[PDB]
DNA sequence: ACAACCTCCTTAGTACATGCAACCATTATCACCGCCAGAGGTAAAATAGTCAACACGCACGGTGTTAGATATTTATCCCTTGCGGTGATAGATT
């Protein structure tokens, strides 16, 4: 039975021990000079399976 | 001379508002058939070309080997649980 009653048993920690959970936003909107960043992987001199994935 | 009035005459002007569902037929009717148009047909040559031949030449895909990645296994680590000790809350007062 326990998993079949868990959305009623594990609904109790819900009211105490009161630390919680969440995710962010992290990027910027792109792009300008100097062209040190304005380059594809072509500029790196690296292998082919890397260049596929 | 006219006026409107008595009576049933007929005429004909209208009939509230919002919305949804359904599919689009019936006619017969000589169009004759004669002429000839530019105008349908097609042979022979322009506007130009097919695809088979023998060459040409290349791409692609499958079989083979290699690569490395991934999902497993293992084991480690931390973040979490639940209870407990005792916390300065909640809020009444200063």
Curated annotation (Swiss-Prot):
The modification ADP-ribosylarginine is found at residue 49. (Microbial infection) ADP-ribosylated on both alpha subunits by the phage T4 protein ModA. ADP-ribosylated on only one of the alpha subunits by the phage T4 protein Alt. It comes from the Bacteria. Signal peptide: none annotated. DNA-dependent RNA polymerase (RNAP) catalyzes the transcription of DNA into RNA using the four ribonucleoside triphosphates as substrates. This subunit plays an important role in subunit assembly since its dimerization is the first step in the sequential assembly of subunits to form the holoenzyme. The N-terminal domain is essential for RNAP assembly and basal transcription, whereas the C-terminal domain is involved in interaction with transcriptional regulators (such as CRP) and with upstream promoter elements. Belongs to the RNA polymerase alpha chain family. Homodimer. The RNAP catalytic core consists of 2 alpha, 1 beta, 1 beta' and 1 omega subunit. When a sigma factor is associated with the core the holoenzyme is formed, which can initiate transcription. Both the N- and C-terminus interact with different regions of transcriptional regulator CRP. The rRNA transcription and antitermination complex (rrnTAC) consists of RNAP, NusA, NusB, NusE (rpsJ), NusG, SubB, ribosomal protein S4, DNA and precursor rRNA; S4 is more flexible than other subunits. This is DNA-directed RNA polymerase subunit alpha. It comes from Escherichia coli (strain K12). The gene is rpoA. The chain holds residues 217 to 269 of 329 of the full protein.
């Amino acid at each position: 039975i326990r998993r079949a009653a868990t959305i009623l048993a594990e609904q109790l920690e819900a009211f105490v021990d009161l630390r919680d959970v969440r995710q962010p936003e992290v990027k910027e909107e792109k792009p300008e000079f100097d062209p040190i960043l304005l380059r594809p992987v072509d500029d790196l001199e690296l292998t082919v399976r890397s260049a596929n994935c």
